[PDB]
Design a protein around this motif. Structure first.
Motif, PDB file in Angstrom:
ATOM      1  N   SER A 263      52.999 -41.918  85.765  1.00 18.25           N
ATOM      2  CA  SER A 263      53.676 -40.734  85.262  1.00 18.25           C
ATOM      3  C   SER A 263      53.496 -40.633  83.748  1.00 18.25           C
ATOM      4  O   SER A 263      53.189 -39.558  83.236  1.00 18.25           O
ATOM      5  CB  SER A 263      55.137 -40.732  85.653  1.00 18.25           C
ATOM      6  OG  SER A 263      55.882 -41.674  84.896  1.00 18.25           O
ATOM      7  N   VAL A 264      53.670 -41.761  83.044  1.00 20.54           N
ATOM      8  CA  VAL A 264      53.506 -41.808  81.598  1.00 20.54           C
ATOM      9  C   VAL A 264      52.114 -41.290  81.242  1.00 20.54           C
ATOM     10  O   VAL A 264      51.978 -40.427  80.377  1.00 20.54           O
ATOM     11  CB  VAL A 264      53.729 -43.216  81.006  1.00 20.54           C
ATOM     12  CG1 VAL A 264      53.413 -43.270  79.515  1.00 20.54           C
ATOM     13  CG2 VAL A 264      55.142 -43.727  81.249  1.00 20.54           C
ATOM     14  N   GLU A 265      51.088 -41.834  81.911  1.00 14.65           N
ATOM     15  CA  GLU A 265      49.706 -41.461  81.651  1.00 14.65           C
ATOM     16  C   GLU A 265      49.504 -39.979  81.963  1.00 14.65           C
ATOM     17  O   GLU A 265      48.959 -39.247  81.142  1.00 14.65           O
ATOM     18  CB  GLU A 265      48.741 -42.337  82.451  1.00 14.65           C
ATOM     19  CG  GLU A 265      47.270 -42.036  82.175  1.00 14.65           C
ATOM     20  CD  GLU A 265      46.282 -42.962  82.866  1.00 14.65           C
ATOM     21  OE1 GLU A 265      46.722 -43.880  83.593  1.00 14.65           O
ATOM     22  OE2 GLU A 265      45.064 -42.762  82.674  1.00 14.65           O
ATOM     23  N   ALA A 266      49.956 -39.548  83.148  1.00 19.51           N
ATOM     24  CA  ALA A 266      49.796 -38.170  83.587  1.00 19.51           C
ATOM     25  C   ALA A 266      50.458 -37.212  82.598  1.00 19.51           C
ATOM     26  O   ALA A 266      49.887 -36.177  82.263  1.00 19.51           O
ATOM     27  CB  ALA A 266      50.364 -37.998  84.979  1.00 19.51           C
ATOM     28  N   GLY A 267      51.667 -37.569  82.146  1.00 16.89           N
ATOM     29  CA  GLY A 267      52.397 -36.787  81.161  1.00 16.89           C
ATOM     30  C   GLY A 267      51.610 -36.631  79.862  1.00 16.89           C
ATOM     31  O   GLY A 267      51.579 -35.545  79.285  1.00 16.89           O
TER      32      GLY A 267
ATOM     33  N   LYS B 276      57.372 -39.233  81.763  1.00  6.91           N
ATOM     34  CA  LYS B 276      56.391 -38.222  81.398  1.00  6.91           C
ATOM     35  C   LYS B 276      56.848 -37.496  80.135  1.00  6.91           C
ATOM     36  O   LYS B 276      56.035 -37.211  79.258  1.00  6.91           O
ATOM     37  CB  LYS B 276      56.174 -37.169  82.490  1.00  6.91           C
ATOM     38  CG  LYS B 276      55.779 -37.692  83.863  1.00  6.91           C
ATOM     39  CD  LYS B 276      55.301 -36.617  84.833  1.00  6.91           C
ATOM     40  CE  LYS B 276      56.287 -35.504  85.022  1.00  6.91           C
ATOM     41  NZ  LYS B 276      55.812 -34.502  85.977  1.00  6.91           N
TER      42      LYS B 276
ATOM     43  N   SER C 292      55.028 -37.507  76.408  1.00  8.84           N
ATOM     44  CA  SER C 292      54.707 -36.306  75.653  1.00  8.84           C
ATOM     45  C   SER C 292      55.299 -36.391  74.247  1.00  8.84           C
ATOM     46  O   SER C 292      54.633 -36.034  73.277  1.00  8.84           O
ATOM     47  CB  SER C 292      55.173 -35.060  76.369  1.00  8.84           C
ATOM     48  OG  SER C 292      56.590 -35.013  76.462  1.00  8.84           O
TER      49      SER C 292
ATOM     50  N   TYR D 239      56.448 -46.057  87.248  1.00  7.91           N
ATOM     51  CA  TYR D 239      56.626 -45.091  86.175  1.00  7.91           C
ATOM     52  C   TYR D 239      55.369 -45.003  85.309  1.00  7.91           C
ATOM     53  O   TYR D 239      55.203 -44.032  84.576  1.00  7.91           O
ATOM     54  CB  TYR D 239      57.855 -45.460  85.334  1.00  7.91           C
ATOM     55  CG  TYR D 239      59.167 -45.496  86.108  1.00  7.91           C
ATOM     56  CD1 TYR D 239      60.032 -44.409  86.120  1.00  7.91           C
ATOM     57  CD2 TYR D 239      59.538 -46.621  86.832  1.00  7.91           C
ATOM     58  CE1 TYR D 239      61.225 -44.445  86.826  1.00  7.91           C
ATOM     59  CE2 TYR D 239      60.725 -46.670  87.545  1.00  7.91           C
ATOM     60  CZ  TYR D 239      61.574 -45.577  87.541  1.00  7.91           C
ATOM     61  OH  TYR D 239      62.748 -45.615  88.237  1.00  7.91           O
TER      62      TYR D 239
ATOM     63  N   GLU E 253      60.450 -41.079  86.831  1.00  6.85           N
ATOM     64  CA  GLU E 253      59.038 -40.882  86.540  1.00  6.85           C
ATOM     65  C   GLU E 253      58.870 -39.697  85.593  1.00  6.85           C
ATOM     66  O   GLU E 253      58.115 -39.782  84.627  1.00  6.85           O
ATOM     67  CB  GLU E 253      58.213 -40.701  87.817  1.00  6.85           C
ATOM     68  CG  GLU E 253      57.824 -42.018  88.485  1.00  6.85           C
ATOM     69  CD  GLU E 253      58.960 -42.823  89.097  1.00  6.85           C
ATOM     70  OE1 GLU E 253      60.104 -42.323  89.145  1.00  6.85           O
ATOM     71  OE2 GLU E 253      58.694 -43.964  89.528  1.00  6.85           O
ATOM     72  N   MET E 254      59.597 -38.608  85.872  1.00 13.86           N
ATOM     73  CA  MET E 254      59.530 -37.400  85.063  1.00 13.86           C
ATOM     74  C   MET E 254      60.066 -37.660  83.653  1.00 13.86           C
ATOM     75  O   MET E 254      59.523 -37.123  82.691  1.00 13.86           O
ATOM     76  CB  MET E 254      60.254 -36.226  85.740  1.00 13.86           C
ATOM     77  CG  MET E 254      61.680 -36.500  86.196  1.00 13.86           C
ATOM     78  SD  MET E 254      62.894 -36.486  84.863  1.00 13.86           S
ATOM     79  CE  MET E 254      62.661 -34.836  84.190  1.00 13.86           C
TER      80      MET E 254
ATOM     81  N   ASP F 180      48.580 -34.185  80.434  1.00 13.41           N
ATOM     82  CA  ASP F 180      49.010 -32.795  80.443  1.00 13.41           C
ATOM     83  C   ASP F 180      49.298 -32.324  79.019  1.00 13.41           C
ATOM     84  O   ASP F 180      48.928 -31.212  78.649  1.00 13.41           O
ATOM     85  CB  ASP F 180      50.219 -32.590  81.344  1.00 13.41           C
ATOM     86  CG  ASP F 180      50.022 -32.958  82.808  1.00 13.41           C
ATOM     87  OD1 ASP F 180      48.906 -33.395  83.162  1.00 13.41           O
ATOM     88  OD2 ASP F 180      50.988 -32.804  83.585  1.00 13.41           O
TER      89      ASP F 180
END
Ligand SMILES: [K+]
Ligand SMILES: [K+]
Ligand SMILES: [K+]
Ligand SMILES: [K+]
Ligand SMILES: [K+]
Ligand SMILES: [K+]
Ligand SMILES: [K+]
Ligand SMILES: [K+]
Ligand SMILES: [K+]
Ligand SMILES: [K+]
Ligand SMILES: [K+]
Ligand SMILES: [K+]
Ligand SMILES: [K+]
Ligand SMILES: [K+]
Ligand SMILES: [K+]
Ligand SMILES: [K+]
Ligand SMILES: [K+]
Ligand SMILES: [K+]
Ligand SMILES: [K+]
Ligand SMILES: [K+]
Ligand SMILES: [K+]
Ligand SMILES: [K+]
Ligand SMILES: [K+]
Ligand SMILES: [K+]
Ligand SMILES: [K+]
Ligand SMILES: [K+]
Ligand SMILES: [K+]
Ligand SMILES: [K+]
Ligand SMILES: [K+]
Ligand SMILES: [K+]
Ligand SMILES: [K+]
Ligand SMILES: [K+]
Ligand SMILES: [K+]
Ligand SMILES: [K+]
Ligand SMILES: [Mg+2]
Ligand SMILES: [Mg+2]
Ligand SMILES: [Mg+2]
Ligand SMILES: [Mg+2]
Ligand SMILES: [Mg+2]
Ligand SMILES: [Mg+2]
Ligand SMILES: [Mg+2]
Ligand SMILES: [Mg+2]
Ligand SMILES: [Mg+2]
Ligand SMILES: [Mg+2]
Ligand SMILES: [Mg+2]
Ligand SMILES: [Mg+2]
Ligand SMILES: [Mg+2]
Ligand SMILES: [Mg+2]
Ligand SMILES: [Mg+2]
Ligand SMILES: [Mg+2]
Ligand SMILES: [Mg+2]
Ligand SMILES: [Mg+2]
Ligand SMILES: [Mg+2]
Ligand SMILES: [Mg+2]
Ligand SMILES: [Mg+2]
Ligand SMILES: [Mg+2]
Ligand SMILES: [Mg+2]
Ligand SMILES: [Mg+2]
Ligand SMILES: [Mg+2]
Ligand SMILES: [Mg+2]
Ligand SMILES: [Mg+2]
Ligand SMILES: [Mg+2]
Ligand SMILES: [Mg+2]
Ligand SMILES: [Mg+2]
Ligand SMILES: [Mg+2]
Ligand SMILES: [Mg+2]
Ligand SMILES: [Mg+2]
Ligand SMILES: [Mg+2]
Ligand SMILES: [Mg+2]
Ligand SMILES: [Mg+2]
Ligand SMILES: [Mg+2]
Ligand SMILES: [Mg+2]
Ligand SMILES: [Mg+2]
Ligand SMILES: [Mg+2]
Ligand SMILES: [Mg+2]
Ligand SMILES: [Mg+2]
Ligand SMILES: [Mg+2]
Ligand SMILES: [Mg+2]
Ligand SMILES: [Mg+2]
Ligand SMILES: [Mg+2]
Ligand SMILES: [Mg+2]
Ligand SMILES: [Mg+2]
Ligand SMILES: [Mg+2]
Ligand SMILES: [Mg+2]
Ligand SMILES: [Mg+2]
Ligand SMILES: [Mg+2]
Ligand SMILES: [Mg+2]
Ligand SMILES: [Mg+2]
Ligand SMILES: [Mg+2]
Ligand SMILES: [Mg+2]
Ligand SMILES: [Mg+2]
Ligand SMILES: [Mg+2]
Ligand SMILES: [Mg+2]
Ligand SMILES: [Mg+2]
Ligand SMILES: [Mg+2]
Ligand SMILES: [Mg+2]
Ligand SMILES: [Mg+2]
Ligand SMILES: [Mg+2]
Ligand SMILES: [Mg+2]
Ligand SMILES: [Mg+2]
Ligand SMILES: [Mg+2]
Ligand SMILES: [Mg+2]
Ligand SMILES: [Mg+2]
Ligand SMILES: [Mg+2]
Length: 276
Positions: A124-128, A166, A170, A121, A162-163, A131
RNA sequence: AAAAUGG
RNA sequence: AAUUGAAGAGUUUGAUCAUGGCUCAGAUUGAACGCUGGCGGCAGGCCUAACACAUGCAAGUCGAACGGUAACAGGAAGAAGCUUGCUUCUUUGCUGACGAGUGGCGGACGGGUGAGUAAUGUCUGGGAAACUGCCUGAUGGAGGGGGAUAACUACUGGAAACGGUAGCUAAUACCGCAUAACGUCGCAAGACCAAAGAGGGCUCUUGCCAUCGGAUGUGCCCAGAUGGGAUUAGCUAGUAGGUGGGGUAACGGCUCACCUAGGCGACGAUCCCUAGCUGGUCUGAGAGGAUGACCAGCCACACUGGAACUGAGACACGGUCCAGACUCCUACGGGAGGCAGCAGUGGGGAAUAUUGCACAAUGGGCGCAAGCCUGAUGCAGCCAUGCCGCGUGUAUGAAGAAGCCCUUCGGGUUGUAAAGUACUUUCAGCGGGGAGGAAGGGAGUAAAGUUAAUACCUUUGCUCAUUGACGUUACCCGCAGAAGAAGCACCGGCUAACUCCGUGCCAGCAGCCGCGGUAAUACGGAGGGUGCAAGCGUUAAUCGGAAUUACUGGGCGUAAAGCGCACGCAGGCGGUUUGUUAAGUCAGAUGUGAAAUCCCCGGGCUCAACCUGGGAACUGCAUCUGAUACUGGCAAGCUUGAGUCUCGUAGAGGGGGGUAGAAUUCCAGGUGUAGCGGUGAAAUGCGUAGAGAUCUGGAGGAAUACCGGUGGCGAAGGCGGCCCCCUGGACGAAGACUGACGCUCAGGUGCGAAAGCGUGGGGAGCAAACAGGAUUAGAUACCCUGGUAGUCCACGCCGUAAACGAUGUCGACUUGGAGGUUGUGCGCGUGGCUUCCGGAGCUAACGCGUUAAGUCGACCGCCUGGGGAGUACGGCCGCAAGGUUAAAACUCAAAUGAAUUGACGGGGGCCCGCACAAGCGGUGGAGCAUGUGGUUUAAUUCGAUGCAACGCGAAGAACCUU
RNA sequence: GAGUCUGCAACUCGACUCCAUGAAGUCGGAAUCGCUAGUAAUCGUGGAUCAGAAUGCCACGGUGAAUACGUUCCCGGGCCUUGUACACACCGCCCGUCACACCAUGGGAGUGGGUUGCAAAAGAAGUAGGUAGCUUAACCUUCGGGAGGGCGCUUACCACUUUGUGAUUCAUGACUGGGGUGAAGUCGUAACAAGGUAACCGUAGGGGAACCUGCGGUUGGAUCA
RNA sequence: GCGGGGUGGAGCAGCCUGGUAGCUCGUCGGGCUCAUAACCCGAAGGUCGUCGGUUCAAAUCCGGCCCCCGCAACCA
RNA sequence: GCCAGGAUGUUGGCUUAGAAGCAGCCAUCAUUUAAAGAAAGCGUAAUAGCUCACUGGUCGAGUCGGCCUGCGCGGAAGAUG
RNA sequence: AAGGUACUCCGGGGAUAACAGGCUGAUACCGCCCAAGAGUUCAUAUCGACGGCGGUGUUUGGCACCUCGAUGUCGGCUCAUCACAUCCUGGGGCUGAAGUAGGUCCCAAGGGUAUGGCUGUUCGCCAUUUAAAGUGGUACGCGAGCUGGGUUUAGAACGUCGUGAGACAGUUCGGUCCCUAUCUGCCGUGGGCGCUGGAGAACUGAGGGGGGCUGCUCCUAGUACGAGAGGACCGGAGUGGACG
């Protein structure tokens, strides 16, 4: 917009007619920018469009691409829990946001301890965050020069996704912006102006009026060269001014330098504009 | 008697 | 001899069979694009803007029609520097010739384009009412006159273009007169109509005029055929016909007047959309499907709209006039022009060529001929655009070299491949020879014919020079040297062709199925291979595969598909017998069905592509002569289908009126006393203002227990107490009667549950809506207590249902068994209807099975992947609700049917377990031990995690262990 | 507080003893576990590990119950049958409203084009008919003229063009209807098992939504011991 | 201008008549479940708008100050 | 009034792209003197430059600025005259 | 013992409101004083915080003095007349005035100073002009001059309020505007007498009235100025709009 398609064709033809004519749509702003070797040059081109090409047009100042950065550091929590029956969506992340070195952009740190957020996870946190940072956290401009440290978090065996993480990420950034006080940044431009020493004082006086700073002066050939850093927005229309001051005996070359915080007054205006 | 749901 | 012809595969599932769509392998192109690129032959080459066009060129010819002579090349003559005999300069149409003009003929051909056109077109087959330059046959004539006029001259207006005025002049230009008959008119008698000369030496040749023929071309007519749409069904007043008049070469409402009221159309009129047609081309086993570039025929058009003139022929690509838009010129008054001829330009487009050469040949115009004109045509240029043929070497060569890739490091592969060696030199290149396309025409010369003539002319021989754009022709020969000549796509399956490395659901690939998340034959690169080859891929496009619109050649119980049912017109189809006709049909014959192409047999280019001789074929159509079974027509029949009558039987068949018993509800009264009612449990509700219960009387509506039934009746929908009245159908028995009177049925018409709608009634019970009480997280429900429309009647409307057997109707045929119901004959027969089961057969299977879903025939309805959608829009119908008819875009690779193995079920049955029950002792609370999570930390090592981690790895961390 | 023992070494961080001290706890919410006999319960004993370090683990004896009527119910498993739209197989599958984005399409005050019907107007040029006037090579003549012709004019037909009113087709239009495709959104759970009220068809009324309710119809429903 | 409000996170009591903070939901801990929801058991959270005044004592009463509603804001 | 001088460590330092008397901020000096601010102004990117203060010479009698008070001045634009 | 009356009526009041006038000037508008700052530097080119002092009568108001035995009221039309705190044209100082074009202040009242769309509108917004589309006073100039759309009688309706009659600083449709001018004033036009004998002419000019606007083009001169872009002063000529 009927003449917009014609404008495209007109600009194409104009470029064929005059090499010095340069047409380029700035992707960030989404506005087409017409480049010329002089004001009169561009004027004639526009007049030609109005007549020859039959394309009604109105010139304007190119819009400037600004960015944002947290001016303060604050630890924040982003929790997203949506469980009402069956498979749900749980995700909690505690992220610390700190002003990054100017130009260093994003420096995410995974300081998760005790494996509270499972490894799967974490990306996903970082990617979120990334974005969400790309989206405006203050006015709408990409957030840069920030460091997000995910020191703590929470997860559920089933609900956690994971989502969801994210989303939680955010949410953290949002609340961080409320506590970290983001500020608008303006793209500074290094301008190299060369002119006879007689007009040196006037040129430097123009730069100060723009808000830019004189880096220094240096003797080259016979015409003194003054290095300086002026905001892109302010730099607009420098060509005409330079020629006016130097009696058409002055040349300048501008290149991007860095992003500086927009004056609080100017920043307020930008926020107002973005708001509406 | 009641007895929903599960990327 | 003209034949020889027919492949599948992948993808729905856990798996299967079926259904059904999607995708692929092939062939083809006027192609385009990408990559690559030796040569030659043959062929092809703006599909787009019927867009606009600079420049040149594409229709002239004839002096044997004529006045002439603008030139020029001569001659004669006369003047001349006087070559003293030529030269010069003038004159003379004087001649060869020939500008301009008159005249004749051509310019209506040839060449271009496909805009328009769904028939005033094309194609096939017939026909009567025509005309036809040049060409050709025959029979006659060809006399004698007149008046002009161009060119020319002078003058004059215009910027120009284009003119005006006066004078003069010719003809194979123009007009009378004569002539006038196998001509025209007229019943006949009668009347009327033409001409041209020119050339060679009186004759010959050519031309002229009249009539009748021929040929040819052209006009016209009829029938069949030739796209799509009914969400276009009505259309039409010269309209349909007649009559008279006029008009055309001719028939004709062709036109006009008048008269009549017609004509066309569901065998598709009218309208809308699209489109040149054909021989043919492509694909296909074929039948079909698609197409109409090049070549050939036909049609239409030529800046747009329109009109006529001339002519044999035009309503005229390079003619005329008018209008319009464009372009150009102008002196502002006025003018000029039309590449859809060839080349070429701009523009448009994915994309389509040189402002070449020659009239050498074929063909055409003019001419006596010579000759002239010809962007027709013959050829050349560019382009891999296609097709065809050929080449880029050939043998030898283990060193199985290096080098690459791979490898289990043994080796293997590239690979005899290369080197190395021995040869050959097509083709290209260089050099040198060399056809054929060339026929004729022009000179003579000869004979014959002709004639007065050995003239002239004509004919046929004879003789001599002479004509090739292509062109440096094909072809042949010689010379040097393997020299100068290979690429493109592909390797997961389909699909022939595999590894390594890099990347890591990224980058990317992809027709379909899918592939890529750290061992990618699927991406990218390399090695190796496969297929093709000066090409190879891609894209577009057509047909095929697709039996997936099924004529050949499919379906409709459950996959998509039987109209809810019936009657019935048009239409389709129809028992049996005789005769007749010969329409269909069949046979033979005849005419036609262009050539090319295709096919077969051949011939010719070194072969092939390519060209060519003959044949075949053109499946068709018309006509004639035959055959007569079958089909059709006509006529007469017959009884077997169909129908009528006589008699009897069963039935909830329909319509109308009447009546009975039971029950519910309500109303009134009596008795009586605290509950009643309802549910899973309650509550709302009702009851001491006497309920509920019980008894008596009355009112009203609705439905008919039992009988009662895989019973019966009806076309279907439906139809149930009993009685009467009116009425439909079915079946049986035994006869008689009629004589194919039949079957199906688009459109049309009728009937058609429930709900609903209109008007007027009725209203017990039940009950959408609504209200309250429960239930629940909520409960707009299910449950409870109430309750309105409606349910009922009359009349009208609606027109739909899983209106179902999810099975159209009619007829015939093809093993059995057990029943029900209703006739009938003599326990055994024989009809009608109906239920279950089952054989063959059929079916994907399930199943169906004499009541077929078997085997056949007639007719109708309907289907063509899943969604979108039975929806939108339009039409029609309806009071409304709605019904009916009925799409498209877009989206997906499926959707689906039957069956199989599991699994699961708040399905069923049968068992079992400290499962429950029956017991006993605990945990959860306290302190403490121990493990774990979390938090803390420099570190609190790491692993274990629902049951099946948590005193677990660890059967023992002070150091060590760690 | 004072010791002992093991161990290089017991501060973090051992066991044990002695003295002193004397916490919570008075029987444990919801919930939940073991056990059918030598069992549970309780009572001691030993062993491995191991220098030392057991309330754990493993093992050994002592004493020693209660209850089981039974299968109505709960849970799990086996076997047979049945329904199924399930097949990483009910922790399955799956419906609609709502929110957001995107695409095609219907309606829409209207707006701009193309084509076309009808009713009129118009009338260049040309051709035909008539003839105010004007003019005239060929023929005739009485020599004056005549015949005939040309021009002009006029009429008919008719192209351009003009007007009004319809039809049709295409484009576009504030806004609006439904459809499709997204993405681990929101709200429920309608269908598939008797799917928990069998489902479905027609019709009517109601309801955020899937739907619910009435009436009639169908089986393409399970159940039956 | 005249009235009514400002109380755990939400919506509502308590004020009248000073002492003497409630209800439902939500939240949190434990349980139930494969898990979530539902359900069960247990617990925490307003010092009462913002101050001043009065009182022994103020959510309560008085008076500002801010906030949020309602009504009125007229007739020449 | 006029004629002169009006400086030197030193561009005080720091900061400032640059900052030298005269951006700003700290200083705040000393030196030669008749006198000359680590500068009162103008000026320059900064410089430079032009002053001034200060002072000397020249000139030859008053001169300078506050306080209190009398009277005036500006501030002071409107619609029939 | 409560209300309605716009269906209304009578007696009274300018003892008391609405309109206009008056007094006042809070407010309003205009000006000045101080100068923190802004203006690269630099208070004062331009501007000006915190505060201060006036002017006008000019908005909203205060007061209730005039008028209730009646002083017609919004807007338009017609016709004006004055002020100047000036919109244009004229003159000038400063400028952060290169030129062109501006900014700001001073002087100046001679003349000049849109048409339309929408609305009852004044206004405003908008379209398109213009050299400019000035700001105010005049009973918010002007109904014994016009209009009658607004507004405020009686009819009627909607929303709203009220039990209701009715009502609304809400809306909607409809809905009688009289006067022959005596005096003053003003525009014209005569009679009388006077001006010293009467009469006919021509005059002088005290005094009064009228008139006074301005564009564009060209030349100067693409000259000055400006790197360019652009583009003059001053002077001269022609031709318009409006008005007479
Ligand atoms: K298939
Ligand atoms: K065509
Ligand atoms: K006709
Ligand atoms: K006729
Ligand atoms: K064909
Ligand atoms: K045409
Ligand atoms: K001819
Ligand atoms: K030729
Ligand atoms: K068939
Ligand atoms: K029939
Ligand atoms: K026959
Ligand atoms: K009822
Ligand atoms: K049928
Ligand atoms: K489809
Ligand atoms: K316990
Ligand atoms: K220790
Ligand atoms: K031990
Ligand atoms: K089962
Ligand atoms: K739409
Ligand atoms: K429309
Ligand atoms: K249901
Ligand atoms: K229903
Ligand atoms: K009263
Ligand atoms: K003042
Ligand atoms: K200044
Ligand atoms: K009054
Ligand atoms: K000025
Ligand atoms: K003035
Ligand atoms: K005024
Ligand atoms: K007034
Ligand atoms: K008025
Ligand atoms: K008056
Ligand atoms: K009046
Ligand atoms: K008076
Ligand atoms: Mg000639
Ligand atoms: Mg002749
Ligand atoms: Mg004759
Ligand atoms: Mg066409
Ligand atoms: Mg086939
Ligand atoms: Mg003719
Ligand atoms: Mg021609
Ligand atoms: Mg042409
Ligand atoms: Mg051409
Ligand atoms: Mg192009
Ligand atoms: Mg020629
Ligand atoms: Mg293979
Ligand atoms: Mg790999
Ligand atoms: Mg294809
Ligand atoms: Mg087919
Ligand atoms: Mg089929
Ligand atoms: Mg089905
Ligand atoms: Mg079906
Ligand atoms: Mg049926
Ligand atoms: Mg029938
Ligand atoms: Mg026959
Ligand atoms: Mg043929
Ligand atoms: Mg017969
Ligand atoms: Mg009967
Ligand atoms: Mg029956
Ligand atoms: Mg009914
Ligand atoms: Mg009814
Ligand atoms: Mg009931
Ligand atoms: Mg009920
Ligand atoms: Mg139906
Ligand atoms: Mg039925
Ligand atoms: Mg059916
Ligand atoms: Mg059977
Ligand atoms: Mg419909
Ligand atoms: Mg319809
Ligand atoms: Mg415990
Ligand atoms: Mg254990
Ligand atoms: Mg250790
Ligand atoms: Mg067993
Ligand atoms: Mg639309
Ligand atoms: Mg005419
Ligand atoms: Mg359900
Ligand atoms: Mg159900
Ligand atoms: Mg069901
Ligand atoms: Mg309901
Ligand atoms: Mg004063
Ligand atoms: Mg005055
Ligand atoms: Mg009233
Ligand atoms: Mg009164
Ligand atoms: Mg008073
Ligand atoms: Mg008084
Ligand atoms: Mg007043
Ligand atoms: Mg007054
Ligand atoms: Mg102030
Ligand atoms: Mg006042
Ligand atoms: Mg008083
Ligand atoms: Mg009075
Ligand atoms: Mg003034
Ligand atoms: Mg004046
Ligand atoms: Mg004046
Ligand atoms: Mg004057
Ligand atoms: Mg206006
Ligand atoms: Mg007034
Ligand atoms: Mg005024
Ligand atoms: Mg009046
Ligand atoms: Mg008045
Ligand atoms: Mg009014
Ligand atoms: Mg005057
Ligand atoms: Mg004056
Ligand atoms: Mg005038």
């Amino acid at each position: 917009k009927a003449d917009q398609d014609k404008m495209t064709q007109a600009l194409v033809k104009l470029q064929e007619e005059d090499p010095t004519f340069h047409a380029h749509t700035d992707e960030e702003t989404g506005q087409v920018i017409i480049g010329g070797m002089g004001e009169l040059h561009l004027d004639i081109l526009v007049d030609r469009m109005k007549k020859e090409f039959n394309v009604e047009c109105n010139v304007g100042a190119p819009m400037v691409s600004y960015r944002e950065t947290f001016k303060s550091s604050a630890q924040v929590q982003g929790k997203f829990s949506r469980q009402s029956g069956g498979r749900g969506q749980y995700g909690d992340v505690h992220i610390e946001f700190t002003p990054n070195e100017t130009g260093a952009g994003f420096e995410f740190e995974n300081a998760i301890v005790g494996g509270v957020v499972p490894r799967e996870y974490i990306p996903s946190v970082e990617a979120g965050l990334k974005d969400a940072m790309e989206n405006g956290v203050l006015a709408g401009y990409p957030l840069i020069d920030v460091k997000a440290k995910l020191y703590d978090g929470s997860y559920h065996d089933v609900d956690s996704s994971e989502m969801a993480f994210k989303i939680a990420a955010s949410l953290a950034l949002k609340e961080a912006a409320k506590k970290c006080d983001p500020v608008i940044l303006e793209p500074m431009m290094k301008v190299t102006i060369e002119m006879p020493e007689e007009y040196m004082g006037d040129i430097m006086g123009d730069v100060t009026s723009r808000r830019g700073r004189v880096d220094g002066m240096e003797p080259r050939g016979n015409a003194q060269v003054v290095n300086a850093y002026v905001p892109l927005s302010e730099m607009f229309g420098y060509a005409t001014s330079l020629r006016s001051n130097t009696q058409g005996r002055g040349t300048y070359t501008m290149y991007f330098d860095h992003y500086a915080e927009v004056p609080k007054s100017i920043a307020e205006d930008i926020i107002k504009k973005n708001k509406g």
